[PDB]
Design a protein around this ligand. Structure first.
Ligand SMILES: *[C@@H]1O[C@H](CO)[C@@H](O[C@@H]2O[C@H](CO)[C@@H](O)[C@H](O)[C@H]2NC(C)=O)[C@H](O)[C@H]1NC(C)=O
Ligand SMILES: *[C@@H]1O[C@H](CO)[C@@H](O)[C@H](O)[C@H]1NC(C)=O
Ligand SMILES: *[C@@H]1O[C@H](CO)[C@@H](O)[C@H](O)[C@H]1NC(C)=O
Ligand SMILES: *[C@@H]1O[C@H](CO)[C@@H](O)[C@H](O)[C@H]1NC(C)=O
Lengths: 372, 48, 395, 49
């Protein structure tokens, strides 16, 4: 009996109680996919701590799968700390937990469910190299993750055989709102169509109203943002210029029960590939991490076998820092109706989208020429 | 080289290149990093 | 009103110290519009139950900020984390005293957190200043692969990346060298480092690794004359001195682990901030309770930010002020030396002034002149291609 | 029209209006950053002379 638990908190997913029985197709590995399910209303730290280690103390939970919402990544930190303290592979999968922590802990076994930063940067570069040919600028505050975002696209810029003329990157000290007007003069000095930026939501509002003050919001431009600027909503604020493009996770069609099944399969396939090949013991814990963490500390960790697991015809391996190689991404844009229209899919560095011509929304040029 | 060294107090050892080619830029197969070929590479890598 | 704070320590006598300190704060500051008061608890060997006791603290009082020190345990890394995670659920600004690990400064993981001491990362600024002083302009940078190492490397590079360009170029790292924590037989790395021009290296890793590389160099004698190097603070303590080559350069914090002055400074600055907070517009509560209330303290960020910008008057540790991320600035540093199996203050680093005001530095090989690095190679290595009228090839 | 004034990608601009209008236009060109040194202005003997 492999202890797999599913926790759905503050959610509306009662019908998923039937979704667990869809895991009866787990005969391919033929190792016990023993599974139960729990639930809960509104959540705090204390509730989570108590509830989960009560469960693991009750019925020998080998692993657990989380799912919640309301976007308070504090739970994403809490679950990681728990994982570290108990040496137990948990797998948080939904909007609440699925917010990538940059630097997790060492003794953790967390393995979140979503895309990194560099992957978003590479998708941006693919989109750009399709039509608009130059990374004409990068304007970013120094919110964390800063130095890596620039480094990734720069490393891809240099290491290519096509044009890629980057004009200038320039940060801004948003913490003191005086010199931003001069740096925004210099932002007008970004005489360049395709600009890129990376900051928080309120910073995006501020920068967009400033670019309105210097008129860079016009149609002689185009903007791109990662899956952090306002993507976590269907309510766009003001100041957001239309035509704006982003790249977010596919939270619009990817089935929550499909997610649950995927995670269940993940843990089961891992347990099989560990035991059947070694006949080892993924020994359960006596209690939640009260005193006896030492007896389990001696056991070698199956994380190596949890890293690389396929199933269903999909490569679902992670990286060492807990994010998906080969995730499922989509591209979205802000049309005139101020609603996030879904445009393109992405898999294996491929792109499929709206027809080969770009929409090029309205605020008289760009004739269309025919030949043979 | 002899005259230059006598003028500048060197000490050295000469070795021919490994693959006869002068040098040009190339993106190798089964990777993404474009690499300097041949003798230019033997310089830029650290071998000379 | 009755505004409350709290902290978790390990002495249990600094409990009474902190009580007397907040008593003084009551008597000292303000025109008595409100009252101030606190409550202290202590650590425990279970991290989970420790966070639980923090939740108990947070229910037992409408807290306004929390403080915490380091217990006598050596697990310095993972001790002060659970309170920060538990508070971030409500953006309760928390102040740290006796921890240095640089993972904490990340504004995206411990989004509500401040401290009274700069972390190990900032240690590189004094290195850069010493480099400017003694004109050493070819430096080897040997570091570990922990997040700490990468933080130190990134900070040092972005600091030395002056390159304004509207005699010669400024000091520049010749190369860097990664290195895996806890591993033995690093000799392969030192063997690669040996044949460079530079005669000066820099190290930053844990103390056991320091001992390992010290012995490894002792086998290869990168410790002879002409070689000089300098380290952080934890490379000259514990298991270090038993293997340090006589004459290295280290440094330490001016005050260090005398946390009582820190207690005083912290309570003073928190009081100074709160008596400027309470009037703005809509404080109205901290979240009473640590259960059921699944919402955030709607004023946390603003109180935290104004606490950050709060320039203090005068503490037991001089004028204290916070960086753009909540870390004490302008703190002093004291340069040391391994004066033949002994430590000695050879100069003090006053904030930005470096003050060599002592007898004499003694460099490793036993010499007495400040050596220069980069004894440029006299031997060269030349490549050439077989081309008839310019280079002939004959057996 | 001041966005279009930024669309005057051009060093030597000329203008002709009253004094208060000159103040207004100059603060606007400050708002769109055309007051910088990548420019030069000329006025007749009516603007504030
Ligand atoms: C899933 O993808 C990863 C990475 O694309 C694969 O790991 C590669 O596996 C091949 C073996 O054929 C190695 O040669 C590569 O070096 C691996 N890549 C990396 C980055 O380590 C993995 O094999 C894939 N698994 C499946 C089932 O497709
Ligand atoms: C990873 O998983 C694949 C599954 O196809 C397997 O063939 C391979 O042996 C595993 N390990 C590595 C290192 O690729
Ligand atoms: C291990 O240490 C020995 C010291 O005798 C050394 O000769 C050897 O090269 C080291 N191994 C590696 C891989 O560096
Ligand atoms: C801490 O410092 C204060 C003054 O800076 C001093 O009075 C006190 O004795 C010190 N405590 C310790 C333990 O060194």
């Amino acid at each position: 009996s492999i202890g797999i638990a599913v926790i759905l908190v503050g959610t509306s997913d009662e019908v998923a109680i039937k979704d667990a029985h869809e895991k009866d197709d787990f005969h391919h590995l033929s190792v016990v996919p023993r599974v139960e399910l729990v639930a809960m209303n509104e959540t705090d730290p204390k509730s989570i701590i108590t509830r989960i280690c009560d469960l693991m103390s009750d019925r020998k939970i080998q692993g657990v799968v989380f799912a919640d919402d309301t976007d308070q990544e504090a739970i994403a930190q809490i679950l990681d700390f728990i994982s570290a303290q108990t040496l137990t592979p948990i797998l948080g999968i939904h909007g609440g937990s699925s917010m990538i922590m940059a630097d997790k802990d060492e003794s953790s076994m967390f393995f979140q469910f979503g895309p990194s930063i560099e992957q978003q940067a590479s998708v941006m570069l693919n989109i750009m190299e399709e039509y608009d040919w130059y990374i004409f600028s990068i304007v970013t505050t120094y919110f964390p993750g800063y130095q890596d975002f620039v480094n990734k696209i720069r490393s891809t810029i240099e290491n290519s055989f096509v044009g890629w003329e980057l004009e200038e990157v320039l940060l801004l000290d948003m913490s003191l709102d005086d010199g931003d007007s001069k740096i925004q003069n210099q932002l007008k000095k970004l005489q360049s169509p395709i600009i890129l930026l990376y900051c928080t939501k309120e910073e995006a509002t501020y920068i967009f109203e400033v670019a309105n003050s210097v008129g860079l919001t016009g149609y002689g431009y185009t903007w791109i943002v990662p899956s952090l600027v306002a993507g976590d909503t269907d309510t766009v604020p003001s100041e957001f210029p239309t035509g704006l493009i982003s790249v977010s996770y596919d939270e619009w069609d990817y089935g929550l029960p499909a997610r649950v099944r995927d995670g269940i399969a993940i843990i089961t396939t891992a347990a099989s590939d560990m035991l059947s090949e070694h006949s080892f013991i993924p020994e359960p814990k006596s209690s939640c991490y009260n005193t006896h963490e030492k007896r389990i500390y001696q056991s070698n960790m199956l994380n190596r076998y949890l890293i690389n697991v396929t199933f269903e015809g999909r490569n679902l391996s992670f990286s060492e820092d807990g994010y998906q190689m080969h995730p499922k991404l989509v591209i979205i844009l802000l049309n005139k109706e101020r609603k996030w229209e879904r445009v393109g899919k992405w898999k294996d560095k491929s792109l499929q989208m709206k027809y080969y011509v770009w929409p090029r929304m309205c605020p008289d040029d760009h004739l269309s020429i025919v030949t043979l | 080289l002899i005259k230059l060294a006598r003028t500048m107090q060197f000490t050295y050892e000469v070795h021919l290149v490994a693959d006869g080619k002068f040098g040009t830029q190339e993106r190798v197969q089964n990777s993404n990093k474009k690499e300097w070929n041949g003798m230019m590479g033997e310089l830029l890598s650290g071998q000379a | 009103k009755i505004v409350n704070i709290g902290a978790v320590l390990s002495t249990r006598k600094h409990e009474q110290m902190f009580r007397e300190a907040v008593n003084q704060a009551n008597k000292r500051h303000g025109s008595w519009k409100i009252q101030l008061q606190a409550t202290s608890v202590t650590h425990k060997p279970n991290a989970i139950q420790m966070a639980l006791s923090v939740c108990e603290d947070l229910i037992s009082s409408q807290v306004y900020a929390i403080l915490v020190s380091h217990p006598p345990t050596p697990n310095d890394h993972f001790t002060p984390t659970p309170v920060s995670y538990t508070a971030g659920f409500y953006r309760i600004p928390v102040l740290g005293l006796t921890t240095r690990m640089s993972i904490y400064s990340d504004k995206s993981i411990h989004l509500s957190f401040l401290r009274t001491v700069p972390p190990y990362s900032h240690q590189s600024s004094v290195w850069f200043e010493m480099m400017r002083v003694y004109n050493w302009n070819h430096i080897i940078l040997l570091v570990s692969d922990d997040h700490e190492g990468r933080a130190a490397q990134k900070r040092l590079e972005t600091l030395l990346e002056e390159r304004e360009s509207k005699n010669k170029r400024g000091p520049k790292a010749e190369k860097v060298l990664q290195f895996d924590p806890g591993t033995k037989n690093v000799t392969a790395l030192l063997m690669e480092a040996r044949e460079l021009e530079a005669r000066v290296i820099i190290l930053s890793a844990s103390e056991d690794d320091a001992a390992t590389v010290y012995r490894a160099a002792a086998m290869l004698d990168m410790t002879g004359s002409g070689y000089v190097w300098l380290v952080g603070e934890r490379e000259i303590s514990g298991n270090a001195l038993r293997y340090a080559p006589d004459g290295i350069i280290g440094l330490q914090l001016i005050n260090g682990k005398n946390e009582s002055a820190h207690i005083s400074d912290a309570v003073g600055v928190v009081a100074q901030a709160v008596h400027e907070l309470l009037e703005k517009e809509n404080i109205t509560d901290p979240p009473r309770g640590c259960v059921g209330n699944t919402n955030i303290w709607k004023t946390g960020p603003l109180f935290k930010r104004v606490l950050m910008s709060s320039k203090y008057a005068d503490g037991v540790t001089g004028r204290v002020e916070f960086n753009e991320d909540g870390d004490r600035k302008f703190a002093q540093y004291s340069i040391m030396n391994l004066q033949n199996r002994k430590l000695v203050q050879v100069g003090i680093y006053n904030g930005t002034h470096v003050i060599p005001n002592d007898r004499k530095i003694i460099w490793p090989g036993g010499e007495t002149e400040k050596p220069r690095g980069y004894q440029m190679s006299t031997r060269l290595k030349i490549v050439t291609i077989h081309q008839e009228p310019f280079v002939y090839v004959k057996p």
